[PDB]
Design a protein around this ligand. Structure first.
Ligand SMILES: CCCCCCCCCCCCCCCC(=O)OC[C@H](COP(=O)(O)O)OC(=O)CCCCCCCCCCCCCCC
Ligand SMILES: CCCCCCCCCCCCCCCC(=O)OC[C@H](COP(=O)(O)O)OC(=O)CCCCCCCCCCCCCCC
Ligand SMILES: CCCCCCCCCCCCCCCC(=O)OC[C@H](COP(=O)(O)O)OC(=O)CCCCCCCCCCCCCCC
Ligand SMILES: CC(C)CCC[C@@H](C)[C@H]1CC[C@H]2[C@@H]3CC=C4C[C@@H](OC(=O)CCC(=O)O)CC[C@]4(C)[C@H]3CC[C@]12C
Ligand SMILES: CC(C)CCC[C@@H](C)[C@H]1CC[C@H]2[C@@H]3CC=C4C[C@@H](OC(=O)CCC(=O)O)CC[C@]4(C)[C@H]3CC[C@]12C
Ligand SMILES: [Ca+2]
Ligand SMILES: [Ca+2]
Ligand SMILES: [Zn+2]
Ligand SMILES: [Zn+2]
Ligand SMILES: [Zn+2]
Lengths: 207, 74, 664, 106, 53, 673, 22
């Protein structure tokens, strides 16, 4: 089920990558005018937003909402209040759009995908297990990784006999299902009324 | 201000009473007046291909009723 | 008192044993017994023809739901009173309604119900056809927003009766049989009726479900009427009908997401989308990407054509809607790459450089001109309905503000004021870059995988904003409380929450709002609730407020948002496919037009009408014939029995039994 | 719709006795083209009526995918069902407008 | 041919189980402790079995 | 260019006269079949055994329709009979007495006998006729066997053996056969559901079939209990033992019959036995109930010593009420947790004795808990002890308490100095740590008391049901964690330093050496879910930017795979799990609450923890139980026929029977006139 | 199925009454 539902993660990963790219462009454009450099430091300096790959790094650690990148990295080093406040508002908008919108959307799509998937999870598991078993059924690859006509006509006749038997059994079974499980319709009632009116007219003509 | 409803497209033609009698006896299984109406059709008082309100002929009506004897007669 | 003495409070009037015998004689279906009872009812005796059961069943009605046509003829021959018996026959769906029409207090049906209204509520094609052959008319309701003397007089007399009568009228008009029978253009009638019913559902707070289901029924009727097309000539006759795909644009205007997103109409739209380029569906995805990249990368050469010689084959290559869409997306990608290069001498005012911010200006001017051109067509209603148009307006406003501020700085670091025009200009440039790069979300509707996800996202943004309203209320409450508590302790190299050592987090209302906003992500530390005055009680009370706000906004409201998003997505995903196809064909018809085909850096008689009307009328009568045939063969069979049909079958065998006994 | 035949409609209703007594007479149904076939025959009928061509292909593949026709005219019903399911799935992938019918046939 | 319903049929699954367990048909009716013991014994001396084959 | 269609499965098309015979017996006329059979007597083109290619022999067509006169007509002509009795049994025609009293593709599996198919159809009448005639179902072996006959049959044909065993168990598990032919239908249903559950466990294939059969047996047992219309009958049913005990109720709990136990009648009986001598407690006002429960809670030791010194006194008999006993046990456990809380409230002693204020009266309570667990393990066995997770938690906490006691006496008689200079494996420190873990387990045992309450009960049961899915996902997360931990350990163990640091690890202010060892890598990757690991722990002191980038990339990949992917997958999967298990929350909550109730029904183990440390009667019991079973089975088969003839779905074969009846009537009057 | 049994019983009763008449 998880392997089946990873496609939802990919389809949503595209949208999140586009949103991340947009906010990375904005923060890099705003903050480019401004030892250990980046977010992988004891004191994460403002220089994390000074490059495109650094901005992608900084906005990547904002997804988990676990204070991996602190908010003082959005402060200019020389006291520009408007630019620092605008960068803080941009980072807050990014954090809202990711954490409080996109993550919950992903949870909702995973809800729908898992409710659809769990109906037939046994069948897919049995198919995958049969593939895994058929990978080991052959004798061409036996040792582990460290140490490494008349017959055709008889087979055709046997397969044709078995196929004819299966065809006969299937036909009788399915005609039993149409006779036993199909519900009546209004057409059946109309046909019954037609037969009754036929018998009434026959009685009228005879008597 | 009241919309006056009218039949925009003509679909059913009544014509004579024999066509309506044939249509009514087709979906009631009235075999003997059906064969009388067919004898009059052989005389030539009516047309075999009659269109009802539903647009179904006598063959379609008796096929819907699933009746083989009157269909064979038709 | 030990036992409850059950009695009959509504005593009514009982019937004589002779009258009861007559009534059960009609109920059983014996011809001779009812005939004899009406013979003694001919003379002025106890048995009367106008006998009313305490259940309310007159003998004519008992004959009506027993489907005994001979008994109904026998009763009408003796002139029993006919009141709502025609209505009972209409609702019963018998073919005795014609002989009820051919003739000459407690009522089950409301007094506003006429035979045509109940026949259309029934949705029987035969009964409606016979009634309009006899001659009927549905009274025309007033406008959705009207102020008439008669309307307000009827509302003052009876608002319940007025609302019920209007609902019955609109239920009668919205029936598929009445539209397919009594309207010249069933598609336009269905479209306008669905629009009117949606506006009435908006206007009428009560009965909203009824009008909504009536509009859904009209849309479904339009979809099943379009489903009867078996030829592309008929489809091109219908969709191009104007009284260019005029009817398709009309259906997009009326938000008919079932007429649209039909496989025949979608196949026609896909044929128009890949104009003169077959085999595109028969290709590999890598070849798809390679062809898309090699057409997008060569876009300015294509845009050079049709600017001088539109009659060239390369000038007609841009006329293909798919190639035009690819060229537009490549132009937007080039503009975004120019923005990227702009993002990648410290003077007070700065002229734009040569490589970037000078080459960008034709794109911005073309975007403004295109926004004005799209504002010209369709008015301001479609501009404010489409949220992407609002996003484009905001982005262009930010761009023009940036240009104006740059001009003001030009002709009028670490030293300027924070209110300086250059700083504001670059901040607005960054925000406009965010908006311009976020515009690319709208490109996902063309793709078959990222389309429905984005459509569902845009569908549930309204619910998200509805939740954000109550969250902002909670935030305002807790911010007011924390600011009231903590503003007596206010004090510094860096004041606020955006420093390494956070201080004065709740000293002002703005800082309190910022700290409570950042507390969702855990970016506000725990020492910000500690004052330097060593008042441990107020510190504990402020920390308790912070904890209560964190609980409400994280354990409670966030998971509440999760649950309601799950419910909203489950509701959306049923019709997400048709919603995505509606958005995709809107995007396709945005490029189907022959106007505004240039990309952004370069965009700065009665006889033929009668023949078209005759062709459309022939196609329409063929379509409604196929539709009534499909409804006949889907309604007369493949539908469960009621308890009545068996009851009718029982009356038939019983009447046959008494007829046989009378014969012998 | 005119593109059907008695054999096509009989396979559409999935009636075994009607099919097996319509198969007593010699009946041949038109072989549909492959999912990648774009010859002159496939590029002439679609221009005349693409809707009729698509409905005719869908009706042919709905007739072939009926169980009773698989019993009556095929030596290996299992292999026919396998290959027909694969072909209908790739047709649903190719024919994006009519993918629901091809998916339900697979 | 991605016939998931054909493969997940109980007859086909039982046949697959009989082919898969081979000559050790009593493993399916064995208790769980004997099952983990059999798995551990076959897994511990795997190079001995490989070299002996 | 066109697909040729030719009939491959060729069959004989018979003759038009035989087709006339077939449509004559399909229409149902009497004279035409007479004429055809008389022509077949003089060897016309019509034969009696006219084999339709669909297998519809004229006897089978006459049996499919319910016209017994035509059935007797072709049975009087010596028409060959094969599985036509089985066809009449499957068709559920009461007129199988003619087929019973008379004298390879076959539409039925070869081991199917008439009794097996009659039990499959679940028709009481046909089963009654077949048992009256004399039938025998082969006895299946038990679930796990190695006898030579079964292994020989499995080696010869495993599919046929599995189908035959499934058919036999389908026949035995039918409600009609159990109601008609079993001595004790309740015991038969319980044991049959147990064997079908075990067979579903063993047979991985046909798991749904055996699970459906077990659910059918449980549903039959619930319906048979539903027919009790007196309290005397319910007391006879629930207290019956094969050899006021409620032995059959205990057996139904043992066989995991949740629907049988959660039936409202036995729920009311268990509530009456629960509130022993409590007039109007179930309708009392809620805060009055709380005040009275508090009053009995403070009065547990006086009742306990009253039971100690005078069990015959009314004060000593007040503890014999199960609700009062439960209240006193909960009050005792609350006193124990209060003492545990007082242990922490209000040293440099290397050999610290237990303080007399708190710890000295903790020891007898630990001995009482251990003795109670030993007594519970002795009386009931070890399988039911390991089936309950709370018993495992209690065993863990008692083992921890015993280890704490042993370490304390070891630290008293040995290793007899400031606190900061002690060894890191000092026995006093280990004793304190194990005491803290045992305190956590003891205070976490309070969630088992939520089952008694009607509001927190189903919620606690649902959380316990979702704990299994929690562990199932934790296995996958643990595999991911070991993968990324070994990767980061292999990358980062070269850059391990001491540098005179007082800290080495992630558990202080300056986080360092996060991925130096595998243990520290596992700890650092464990704490990344909660965001207590900072970003600078992926940095080395050297100027190696490539290894730092690889470590940051692997850390970010692990963070994505856990938090974004696996946590949201877990959220969706437990969303689905709670949607699935909330439909049946009431029955499992009532089952668990009844297990808790009859935990306090027995006379043994009455005292709380600090003070815890013949033939004629059996024959008349069998007669009474058999008469109650006769009444219950009669009511159940009556209701089975009532509910069965009011099935709201009408099929299409009955319309064909109506058509055949109308056509036969028409042909009869046409012959008469 | 109760009303189907009612239909069968009613048709059988009519058949047997017709047989009694003739
Ligand atoms: C074995 C099965 C395990 C479970 C299934 C796993 C499926 C695959 C999981 C995703 C792919 C691996 C992780 C890819 C990310 C990565 O490696 O990212 C790792 C790096 C870390 O770099 P730094 O540590 O230097 O910042 O990220 C970057 O380089 C930043 C720029 C690229 C950003 C890509 C972000 C992708 C989106 C991931 C989060 C989505 C959030 C959506 C909810 C809001
Ligand atoms: C891309 C497609 C998906 C997203 C589509 C759009 C939906 C999301 C739209 C987000 C719009 C911006 C959000 C506000 C950010 C902001 O104003 O952030 C800007 C500032 C932050 O300022 P600083 O960063 O300087 O501290 O916020 C404040 O000043 C505090 C007061 C306003 C708080 C507004 C909070 C609105 C609700 C967001 C939190 C919801 C939590 C709910 C918990 C249950
Ligand atoms: C606004 C409408 C929507 C919300 C309606 C109300 C619903 C929410 C009501 C919350 C009421 C406050 C709850 C207690 C918080 C508090 O005041 O907490 C306040 C204090 C915090 O003290 P300091 O901040 O001084 O450390 O908590 C404590 O003192 C610790 C002991 C009490 C802990 C109680 C915890 C209760 C559970 C809360 C967390 C649940 C997490 C579950 C995870 C699975
Ligand atoms: C980060 C950005 C600035 C550059 C790298 C990403 C682009 C190369 C991608 C991102 C989104 C892509 C678009 C997403 C969706 C589509 C629809 C798709 O075409 C269709 O689906 C056509 C209609 C159909 O097939 O029915 C391919 C082109 C296009 C515009 C894509 C073109 C390439 C785009 C712009
Ligand atoms: C720090 C120590 C003192 C523990 C603090 C918490 C306790 C005082 C609470 C926690 C859970 C409570 C229990 C939760 C549920 C119930 C069930 C309820 O009783 C019933 O429902 C009885 C059965 C019935 O009424 O049918 C009230 C008592 C009891 C045991 C409660 C008793 C008091 C408990 C143990
Ligand atoms: Ca726009
Ligand atoms: Ca225990
Ligand atoms: Zn008005
Ligand atoms: Zn071709
Ligand atoms: Zn055995």
């Amino acid at each position: 089920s998880m392997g089946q539902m990873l496609q939802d993660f990919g389809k949503f990963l595209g949208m999140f990558l586009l949103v991340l790219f947009s906010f990375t462009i904005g923060l890099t454009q705003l903050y480019d005018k401004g030892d250990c450099v980046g977010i992988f430091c004891e004191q994460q300096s403002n220089d994390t937003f000074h490059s495109f790959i650094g901005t992608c790094f900084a906005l990547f650690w904002y997804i988990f909402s676990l204070a991996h990148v602190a908010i003082f990295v959005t402060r200019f080093s020389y006291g520009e209040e408007l630019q620092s406040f605008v960068g803080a508002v941009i980072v807050g908008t990014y954090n809202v759009v990711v954490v409080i919108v996109l993550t919950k959307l992903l949870v909702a799509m995973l809800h729908k995908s898992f409710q659809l998937i769990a109906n037939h999870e046994d069948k897919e598991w049995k198919f995958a297990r049969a593939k895994l078993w058929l990978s080991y059924f052959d004798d061409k690859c036996t040792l582990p990784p460290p140490f490494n006509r008349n017959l055709k006509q008889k087979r055709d006749e046997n397969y044709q006999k078995v196929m004819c038997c299966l065809v006969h059994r299937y036909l009788t079974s399915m005609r039993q299902k149409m006779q036993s499980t199909d519900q009546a319709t209004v057409e059946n009632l109309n046909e019954l009324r037609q037969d009754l009116s036929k018998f009434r007219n026959e009685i009228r003509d005879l008597l | 201000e009241v919309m006056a409803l009218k039949d925009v497209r003509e679909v059913k033609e009544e014509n004579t009473l024999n066509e309506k009698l044939f249509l009514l006896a087709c979906d009631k299984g009235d075999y003997y007046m059906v064969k009388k109406i067919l004898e009059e059709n052989s005389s030539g008082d009516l047309n075999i291909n009659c269109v009802d309100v539903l647009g179904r002929n006598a063959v379609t009506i008796t096929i819907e009723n699933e009746n083989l004897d009157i269909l064979q007669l038709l | 008192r030990d036992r409850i003495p059950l009695r009959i409070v509504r005593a009514e009037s009982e019937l004589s044993p002779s009258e009861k015998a007559y009534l059960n004689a009609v109920e059983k279906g014996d011809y001779a017994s009812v005939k004899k009872s009406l013979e003694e009812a001919e003379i002025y005796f106890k048995i009367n023809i106008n006998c009313i059961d305490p259940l309310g069943r007159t003998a004519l009605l008992i004959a009506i739901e027993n489907e005994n046509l001979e008994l109904i003829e026998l009763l009408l021959s003796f002139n029993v009173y006919v009141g709502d018996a025609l209505l009972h026959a209409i609702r019963k769906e018998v073919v005795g309604a014609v002989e009820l029409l051919l003739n000459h207090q407690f009522s089950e049906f409301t007094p506003d119900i006429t035979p045509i209204i109940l026949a259309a509520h029934t949705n029987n094609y035969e009964i409606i056809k016979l009634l309009v052959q006899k001659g009927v008319s549905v009274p025309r309701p007033h406008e959705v927003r009207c102020n008439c003397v008669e309307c307000v007089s009827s509302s003052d007399v009876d608002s319940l009766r007025h609302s019920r009568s209007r609902l019955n009228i609109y239920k009668a008009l919205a029936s598929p049989s009445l539209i397919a029978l009594s309207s010249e253009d069933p598609f336009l009638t269905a479209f306008q009726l669905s629009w009117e019913l949606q506006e009435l559902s908006k206007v009428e707070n009560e009965f909203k479900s009824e009008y909504e289901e009536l509009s859904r029924q009209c849309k479904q009727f339009a979809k099943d009427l379009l489903d009867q097309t078996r030829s592309s000539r008929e489809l091109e006759i219908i969709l191009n009908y104007r009284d260019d795909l005029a009817r398709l644009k009309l259906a997009i205007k009326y938000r008919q997401k079932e007429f649209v997103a039909q496989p025949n109409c979608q196949q026609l739209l896909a044929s128009r989308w890949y104009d003169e380029f077959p085999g595109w569906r028969r290709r590999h995805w890598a070849v798809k990407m390679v062809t898309c990249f090699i057409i997008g990368l060569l876009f300015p050469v294509f845009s050079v054509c049709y600017l001088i010689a539109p009659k060239s084959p390369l000038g007609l290559f841009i006329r293909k809607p798919f190639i035009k869409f690819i060229c537009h997306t490549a132009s937007y990608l080039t503009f975004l790459f120019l923005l990227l290069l702009a993002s990648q001498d410290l003077n007070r005012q700065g002229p734009p450089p040569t490589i970037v911010e000078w080459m960008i200006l034709p794109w911005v001017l073309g975007f403004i001109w295109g926004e004005i051109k799209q504002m010209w067509d369709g008015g301001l209603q479609d501009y404010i309905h489409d949220w992407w148009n609002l996003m484009d307006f905001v982005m262009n406003s930010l761009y023009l503000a940036t240009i104006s501020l740059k001009i003001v700085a030009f002709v009028k670091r670490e030293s300027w004021d924070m209110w300086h025009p250059t700083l504001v200009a670059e901040a607005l440039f960054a925000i406009a870059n965010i908006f311009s790069s976020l515009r690319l979300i709208s490109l996902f509707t063309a793709n078959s995988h990222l389309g429905p996800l984005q459509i569902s996202l845009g569908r549930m943004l309204l619910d998200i904003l509805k939740f954000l309203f109550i969250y902002c209320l909670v935030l305002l409450a807790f911010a007011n409380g924390l600011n009231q508590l903590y503003f007596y302790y206010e004090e510094l190299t860096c004041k606020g929450i955006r420093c390494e050592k956070q201080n004065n987090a709740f000293s002002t209302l703005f800082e309190t709002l910022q700290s409570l906003f950042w507390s969702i992500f855990g970016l506000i530390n725990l020492y910000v609730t500690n004052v330097k005055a060593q008042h441990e009680f107020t510190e504990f009370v402020g920390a308790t407020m912070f904890g209560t706000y964190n609980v409400i906004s994280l354990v409670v409201l966030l998971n509440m948002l999760i649950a309601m998003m799950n419910n909203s997505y489950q509701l959306i995903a049923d019709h997400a496919d048709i919603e995505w196809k509606f958005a995709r064909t809107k995007l396709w018809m945005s490029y189907f037009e022959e106007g505004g085909t240039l990309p952004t850096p370069f965009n700065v008689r009665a006889a033929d009408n009668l023949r078209r009307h005759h062709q459309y009328q022939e196609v329409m009568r063929n379509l409604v014939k196929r539709y009534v045939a499909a409804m006949i063969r889907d309604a007369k069979t493949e539908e469960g029995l009621t308890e009545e049909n068996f009851k009718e079958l029982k009356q038939d065998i019983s009447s046959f039994r008494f007829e046989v006994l009378g014969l012998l | 719709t005119m593109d059907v035949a008695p054999v096509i409609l009989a396979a559409h209703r999935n009636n075994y006795e009607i099919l097996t007594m319509l198969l007593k007479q010699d009946v041949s149904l038109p072989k549909p083209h492959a999912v990648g076939c774009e010859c002159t025959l496939c590029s002439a009928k679609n221009k005349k009526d693409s809707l009729r061509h698509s409905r005719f292909r869908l009706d042919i593949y709905r007739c072939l995918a009926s169980p009773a026709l698989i019993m009556l005219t095929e030596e290996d019903p299992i292999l026919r069902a396998f290959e027909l399911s694969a072909d209908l799935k790739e047709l649903s992938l190719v024919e994006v407008e009519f993918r629901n019918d091809y998916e339900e046939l697979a | 041919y991605n016939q998931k319903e054909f493969v997940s049929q109980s007859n086909c699954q039982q046949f697959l189980n009989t082919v898969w367990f081979g000559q050790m048909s009593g493993y399916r009716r064995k208790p769980t402790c004997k099952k983990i013991m059999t798995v551990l014994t076959v897994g511990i001396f795997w190079p001995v079995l490989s070299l002996c084959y």
